Ligand binder design. Structure first.
Ligand SMILES: Cc1cc(/C=C/C#N)cc(C)c1Nc1ccnc(Nc2ccc(C#N)cc2)n1
Ligand SMILES: C=C(C)[C@H]1CCc2c(c(C)cc(O)c(=O)c2O)C1
Ligand SMILES: [Mn+2]
Ligand SMILES: [Mn+2]
Lengths: 407, 555
């Protein structure tokens, strides 16, 4: 049977243009859709259906099996809002380990309400516009649709009752196509319970992949002031600048003693010995920075904003917040990936990592502000994307001064 | 002999709307007899059907003489029904670009101006297509008709016809992967490479395939044969171009004339290499309104004149050979203009093109080159489904220095340096640490919001000082002026300390050309220095060099 669904009142279906696809992606999508059509998952549609949602292809990693990904951002925003009868696992973020599981295939075993199907239309375009684009619409619950985990909930709730009752300490959370499973087990039983879980699912009617995370191992990032034996006028100028900035987050910060070191027009490279009034003030200020911020709270009706700064030689810093200067999370990615060759691949990898963390902690994705030209991002993100969801984003074109102060 | 019917598409009016109820216009006795004759055969052919008085919808019908012929033609004005008809999925959004097509030995053109009326219109939607032929003298109830097939002029006819035609051709194309089929309009075009011997066979098989739907296709030699005039181009069996581009010879140019010229040069730029249009589009800075008869700067005539020497003789592009690699070459022209050519074999261009920077006051060559590359990349994906290999005028070393130090993430796909001046280069590099032994200039500006008077100056560690009185100026301006003074009065190496976020935001943006001559002067100064370290400090935090110079310019 089919639980009904409608759009938010005011609102017609999505009419989003399909963006140019490379030849490799088109062949992959043609092959995939051909077999999904055979299987009744999707059906060809006519011109009386004016809706459209973008679609592209992504090879999950270290592999050669393409996935088809539909960008339901617009439909999601546009489809009414599906309360049931979750708010959040405040302890998923606490659990030693967490394994992420692709359970999206389950969705294709529930039919979609015939009156809503038209809204899931998508086009596989042709190179150089030479033949008409192949049009299709979903007949079953589609992956990437927010209605999808919601409607299927009931069915997933009872599909997991056995495992959940026999393992009352394991935390299982579900976001879009993804099942998040967290436990303090030692990292080898943890795997047994997982590869159990899926055998317990793959009985129950590519879920073999795993992405292990360690929330207890994340990796926050306060502000730090340098510890030096000899300070030049420039070191002190940079220090006073950083402290002036931090005083916008922490009220007790004070500079005056450090500022009064730089009395006179001195050469930037001149060494300046610190007064005891200075070295006290610097000390009290270090203390204040070890305390956490004041009045910082999450307000689940508000959007999460994520900012990212390129710190060079492969490092990237970021902050998540809802209110300016009220950081809920800050971090750094002095990882490898991506370069030393490719800036954009690194940025794409960072966005995915931050999104994953945001899902685990608050159960929703943040709106990204990206240090890159819109034209450069749009032309390349899909070539490195590997997640089944897609967050929102906007572009930053003015270099932020606070760049250094977060590294 | 049985024939498969053509399934109809369910059509609806937009929600909340009802059919059209437009009044029929009064016609001349002559036009009515003509319409009656015309409608009579259409009805005999099944295209339309007489309807009762129940139907309350109406659409105006007209009669237009055909280029002064002995014949008449009927025009049903569906503008009003079109506003109330649902939206459809246009699958002829874009036309394919000539540079993307494959070369075909043989290409036949089959007409289907008849198969268009074998396409039925959804039964429940027919009532909305009602129209009325007025009666002679208005003495009898006008003849009422409604359509049974896709009406010419109705919003959905194109989409429904094209999709119906595609659905029929779908199995033929698939089964015959050695031919290409394109449904532009009412004539069907089929190309191929196989010897004309068997290419004629394929055509006969297609006509046979179309007979399954009782669509006949009319067994003559269509008037259309290579070359074809299509979408502003000339398509030939092995080559393509634009059509004829002719630049008027004029003693007077008015906003329109220049807009018309820019249009031709833009359209021509896809195959004619080198085309420039900056000095022209610059003369149309921004108004709506023809005409004005604006004059041509000594650059417009020089830049345009160079155009004529490009379009002097015909230039043709080749077609795409999938088995061969695509290569894109870019050259800087200056004034923020760039030109590129895409080819697979040396000197044999598939297509060419230009790029122009967007609105902005500060920019640099590297950023412009990058934008050009992204544009070419996108266009390439659309036309060939792949990214070309790039040949660019910039040294690998320059590019590396640039992207590793730029605050934004950036990327260019697989490319190679091509040594053809003018090369793109980095004009100056700020230093990462303060310079030892170099004089430290603490700069500042200030201006009175009201009087607009300000001061710009600096003080250094060596006691050097300066404060200059300024008129007609803003805070942001004064702060840029102070930096300029420090640059002017310092040696080849220098440390500059400012408190202006605005000035830093501009130099951190790393421009090599600007719309503000102030910034241009500064740029010119940076270029002449050996080493420059720009430092920033917060205003009013009790700092030397800064607290002093601030007092000197505040007044
Ligand atoms: C887009 C298109 C327009 C017309 C025609 C439209 C009109 N009028 C005719 C055809 C057959 C096609 N389609 C394709 C697809 C792939 N390669 C080609 N090659 C190709 C086309 C025409 C000539 C010529 N002469 C040579 C090669 N054409
Ligand atoms: C509140 C103040 C002390 C005044 C006076 C100087 C002054 C002020 C401001 C806003 C900005 C500057 O960049 C600056 O250099 C100033 O000297 C404001
Ligand atoms: Mn200032
Ligand atoms: Mn000042």
């Amino acid at each position: 049977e089919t639980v009904p669904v409608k759009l938010k009142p005011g609102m017609d279906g999505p009419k989003v243009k399909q963006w140019p696809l490379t030849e490799e992606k088109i062949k992959a999508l043609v092959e995939i859709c051909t077999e999904m059509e055979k299987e009744g998952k999707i059906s060809k549609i006519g011109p009386e259906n004016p809706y459209n949602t973008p679609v592209f292809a992504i090879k999950k990693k270290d592999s050669t099996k393409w996935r088809k990904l539909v960008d339901f951002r617009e439909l999601n925003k546009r489809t009414q809002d599906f309360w049931e009868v979750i708010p959040h696992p405040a302890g998923l973020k606490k659990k030693k380990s967490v394994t992420v599981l692709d359970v999206g295939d389950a969705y294709f075993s529930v039919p979609l309400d015939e009156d809503f199907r038209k809204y899931t239309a998508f086009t596989i375009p042709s190179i150089n516009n030479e033949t008409p684009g192949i049009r299709y619409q979903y007949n079953v619950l589609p992956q990437g649709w927010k209605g999808s985990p919601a409607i299927f909930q009931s069915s997933m709730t009872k599909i997991l009752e056995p495992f959940k009752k026999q393992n009352p300490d394991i935390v299982i959370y579900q976001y879009m196509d993804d099942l998040y499973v967290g436990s303090d087990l030692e990292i080898g039983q943890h795997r047994t319970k997982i590869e159990e879980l899926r055998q317990h699912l793959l009985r129950w009617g590519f879920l073999w992949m795993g992405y292990e995370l360690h929330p207890d191992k994340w990796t926050v990032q306060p502000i730090v002031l340098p510890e030096k034996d000899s300070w030049t006028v420039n070191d002190i100028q940079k220090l006073v600048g950083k402290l002036n900035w931090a005083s916008q987050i922490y009220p007790g910060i004070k500079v005056r003693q450090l500022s009064k070191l730089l009395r006179g027009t001195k050469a930037l490279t001149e060494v300046i010995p610190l007064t005891e009034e200075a070295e006290l003030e610097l000390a009290e200020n270090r203390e204040i920075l070890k305390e956490p911020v004041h009045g910082v709270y999450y307000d689940p009706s508000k959007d999460l904003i994520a900012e990212i700064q390129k710190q060079g030689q492969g490092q990237w810093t970021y902050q998540i917040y809802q209110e300016p200067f009220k950081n809920l999370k800050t971090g750094k990615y002095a990882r490898m990936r991506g370069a030393h060759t490719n800036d954009v691949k690194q940025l794409t990898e960072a966005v995915q990592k931050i999104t994953t963390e945001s899902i685990v902690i608050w159960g929703k994705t943040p709106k990204f502000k990206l240090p890159i030209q819109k034209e450069t991002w749009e032309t390349w993100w899909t070539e490195y994307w590997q997640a089944t969801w897609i967050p929102e984003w906007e572009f930053v074109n003015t270099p932020p001064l606070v760049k250094l102060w977060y590294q | 002999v049985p024939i498969s019917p053509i399934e109809t598409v369910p059509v609806k009016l937009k929600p909340g709307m009802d059919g059209p109820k437009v009044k029929q216009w009064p016609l001349t006795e002559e036009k009515i007899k003509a319409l009656v004759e015309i409608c009579t055969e259409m009805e005999k052919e099944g295209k339309i059907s007489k309807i009762g008085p129940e139907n309350p919808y109406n659409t105006p019908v007209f009669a237009i003489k055909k280029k002064d012929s002995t014949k008449w033609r009927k025009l049903v004005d569906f503008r009003e029904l079109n506003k109330r008809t649902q939206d459809f999925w246009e699958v002829q959004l874009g036309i394919p670009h000539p540079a993307g097509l494959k070369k075909k030995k043989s290409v036949t053109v089959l007409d289907v101006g008849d198969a268009y009326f074998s396409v039925p219109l959804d039964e429940d939607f027919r009532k909305y297509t009602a129209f009325t032929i007025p009666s002679i003298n208005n003495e009898t109830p006008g003849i009422r008709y409604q359509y049974n097939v896709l009406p010419q002029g109705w919003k959905g006819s194109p989409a429904i016809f094209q999709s119906s035609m595609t659905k029929i051709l779908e199995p033929f194309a698939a089964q015959n992967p050695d031919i290409v089929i394109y449904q532009y309009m009412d004539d069907l075009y089929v190309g191929s490479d196989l010897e004309i011997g068997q290419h004629r066979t394929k055509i006969e098989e297609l006509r046979q395939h179309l007979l399954r739907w009782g669509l006949t296709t009319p067994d003559k030699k269509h008037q259309k044969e290579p070359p074809f005039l299509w979408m502003g181009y000339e398509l030939h069996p092995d080559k393509w171009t634009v059509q004829p581009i002719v630049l008027p010879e004029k003693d007077s140019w008015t906003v329109n004339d220049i807009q018309k010229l820019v249009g031709k040069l833009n359209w021509a730029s896809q195959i004619y290499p080198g085309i420039k249009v900056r000095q022209l589009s610059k003369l149309l800075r921004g108004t709506k309104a023809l005409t004005e008869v604006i004059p041509l700067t000594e650059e417009a005539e020089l830049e345009l004149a160079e155009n004529r020497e490009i379009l002097k003789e015909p230039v043709h592009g080749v077609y795409y050979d999938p088995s061969k690699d695509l290569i894109a070459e870019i050259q800087k022209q200056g004034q923020g203009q760039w030109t590129y050519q895409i080819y697979q074999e040396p000197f044999k261009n598939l297509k060419t093109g230009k790029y122009a920077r967007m609105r902005g006051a500060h920019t640099n060559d590297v950023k412009q080159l990058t934008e050009a590359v992204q544009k070419i990349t996108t266009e390439s994906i659309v036309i060939w489904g792949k990214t070309p290999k790039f040949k660019l005028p910039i040294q690998k070393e320059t590019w590396e220095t640039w992207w590793t130090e730029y605050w934004q993430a950036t990327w260019i796909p697989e490319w190679e340096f091509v040594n053809t001046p003018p090369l793109v280069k980095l004009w100056y590099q700020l230093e990462k640490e303060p310079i030892v032994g170099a004089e430290t200039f603490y700069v500042d500006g200030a201006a009175n919001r009201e009087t607009k008077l300000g001061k710009a100056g600096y003080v250094t560690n060596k006691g050097r000082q300066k404060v200059v009185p300024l008129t007609n100026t803003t805070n942001q301006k004064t702060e840029l002026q102070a930096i300029y003074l420090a640059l002017q009065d310092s040696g080849l190496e220098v440390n500059i300390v400012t408190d202006s976020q605005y000035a830093l935001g501009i130099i951190q943006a790393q421009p090599d050309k600007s719309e503000s001559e102030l910034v241009n002067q500064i740029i010119e100064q940076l270029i002449k220095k050996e080493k420059v370290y720009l430092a920033w400090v917060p205003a009013h935090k009790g700092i030397g060099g800064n607290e002093q110079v601030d007092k000197l310019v505040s007044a």
